[PDB]
Amino acid sequence: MAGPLSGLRVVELAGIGPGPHAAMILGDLGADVVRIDRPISRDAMLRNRRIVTADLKSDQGLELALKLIAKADVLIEGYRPGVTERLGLGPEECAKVNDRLIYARMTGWGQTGPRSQQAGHDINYISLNGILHAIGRGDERPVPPLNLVGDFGGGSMFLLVGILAALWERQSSGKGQVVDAAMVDGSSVLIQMMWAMRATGMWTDTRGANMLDGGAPYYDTYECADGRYVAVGAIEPQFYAAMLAGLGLDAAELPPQNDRARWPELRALLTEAFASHDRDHWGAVFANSDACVTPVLAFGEVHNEPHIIERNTFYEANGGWQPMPAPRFSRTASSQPRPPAATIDIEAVLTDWD
Amino acid sequence: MAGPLSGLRVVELAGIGPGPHAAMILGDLGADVVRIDRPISRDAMLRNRRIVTADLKSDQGLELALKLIAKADVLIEGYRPGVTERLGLGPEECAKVNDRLIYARMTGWGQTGPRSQQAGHDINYISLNGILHAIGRGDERPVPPLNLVGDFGGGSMFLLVGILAALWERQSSGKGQVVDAAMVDGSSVLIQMMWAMRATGMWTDTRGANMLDGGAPYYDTYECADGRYVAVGAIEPQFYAAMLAGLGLDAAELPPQNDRARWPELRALLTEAFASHDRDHWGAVFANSDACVTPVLAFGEVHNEPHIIERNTFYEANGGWQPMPAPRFSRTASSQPRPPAATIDIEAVLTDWD
């Protein structure tokens, strides 16, 4: 198996959302991941796995799972706190068979506290920590940024960091430990820049009136003549200048870039200019420039974009594109992910693993 | 220094956005991070560092930088590709003095390809890979989800995963290597669940008309009587039922949860219900059940929320709150972050580092 994590052994207890995303990336980077499900997937997320089944409620299934775990470097579970405990797969039971184990617990609310036993989804975790409030236009109710911030950016990505950090630790202690990855925590560290900026007046709690939330005319999307969109990210003055130059707008006729009182005016002039030609016109105009103007591509156009083609950011799988592994490694590179395959015998995996 | 990365040595070449956020998390987890800037910060992001200065364009500063890199495990740089090369600090130069170095390159577009020399910001990277298009209400232009998805979720977080994975590879190869972390790549892997769902009919390219983008009446925010908001995330039928009960709605008088044709009707009945009382009323109705209803808190209210208080997700600093380290480790726990302190002499760090 190719990649920097070649040799690493991971048991994943089948769940939804952040846990399988974390397992996927481990497999992408070359880890040997074995997912235990209940008694061929068309879910591309289950790439780079071997799937086995066990009833964790039976004596036989518990025993087979504990034998797998005994040979593994990492366990990923995403149930409610207390669930693995009651199954006999809790941290203390795993430690008896394998004290080198990195026991990774993926939850929204965390292992303890008043909400720890309560159901939730991404939108709920980001509603409690100020994140969701900060997303969307100021004249409307907050919009969910899909499940990118809670489930993934502040969820599976923190599980991954904790797993890999604890493996580093084990190189010198010889021992594993438990990683408590709560999406409410991870997402807060994900948005630390905004917490930093609040303290210095560089960010306000007012929705849609900051530099990065759509409040700034030079950091937003604009609708073009064809009803398609461009993104403008021209924060730095020399980038802003390049953007005006391509629009053919005279700076001396516009409000200054950062005169906030005239941002309505500035936005209306930029709106009119971008609305005068189609999206693809602006790709030609701004070619090879620092104007920070890009087309807003829909998913179904992405694979035709030259920078995406040339870098092989995606690969073609089962009637659709899927993202290639990230990040990239110069010496031990990842390969194209292996598709989901048929279930296999758990006894066969133990034998492979010894 | 407390945490699982105690003993790790990191040189950070001062930059903005993704690079310093990755350095921050390494520090938060115990790494010994030394940031080289140009010749006391009030930026909480620069916590858990030592700051030194050097003019990398001069013979003396380059030589001092190279001596630091000689002793480090990890180098973080976020300039345009080619910049460290021309300074004398490219991967091939650093390998000469330290072949165990993890050379970590944080860009938007990546090290190669047609856009790789062009300026940009978060909004631009997520415009090119279909993510930005997918965010916001269907009747308005796309809204940026701040810089959470490109800079951090698909940016620093993949740089971290690359660093830590390469450290694992290094344990058996005895060598480091170069990590190419491009935001356009990382963010695509962050959104892999949507790429999966597109291939199985579970996601459309139509904006604002999906299960997780605000298209579903049971996965969105609602405005309450006081003009404040709740978030509803009641996907599963049992969670949906608990939500209807809290609202005092009789299920028999509503359309079925997943009768999409009647989702306008359902949303209108849900709108009217939530509008009848203020946010904190619903926060109390729904405080314990599995209804998946949470109050939408603004940043300045977060620290008063019980679940946030009890788990110490935040700590006080400067004049406000900052997130504590995440994720959490049961044996080698992180400490409260150290604030940015005064600059120090580079030669002293070299002494300490031997």
Author numbering:
A (entry chain B), B (entry chain A): 1 to 39, 45 to 359
From the reporting publication:
α-Methylacyl-CoA racemase in M. tuberculosis (MCR) has an essential role in fatty acid metabolism and cholesterol utilization, contributing to the bacterium’s survival and persistence. It catalyses the racemization of α-methyl-branched fatty acyl-CoAs, converting the (2S)-epimer to a near racemic mixture of the (2R)- and (2S)-epimers. The enzyme enables the conversion of α-methyl-branched fatty acids derived from cholesterol metabolism into forms that can be utilized by M. tuberculosis for growth and persistence within the host, a key component of M. tuberculosis pathogenesis.
The electron density maps for both monomers within the MCR homodimer were of high quality, except for residues 41 to 44, which form part of a flexible loop region. A surface representation of the MCR structure shows the extended binding groove, which is made up of residues from the large domain of one subunit and the smaller domain of another subunit. Within each active site, the side-chain of D156 sits parallel to H126 (from one monomer), which is hydrogen-bonded to residue E241 from the second monomer. Sandwiched between the D156 and H126 residues, a piece of electron density corresponding to part of a polyethylene glycol molecule (from the crystallization medium) was observed.
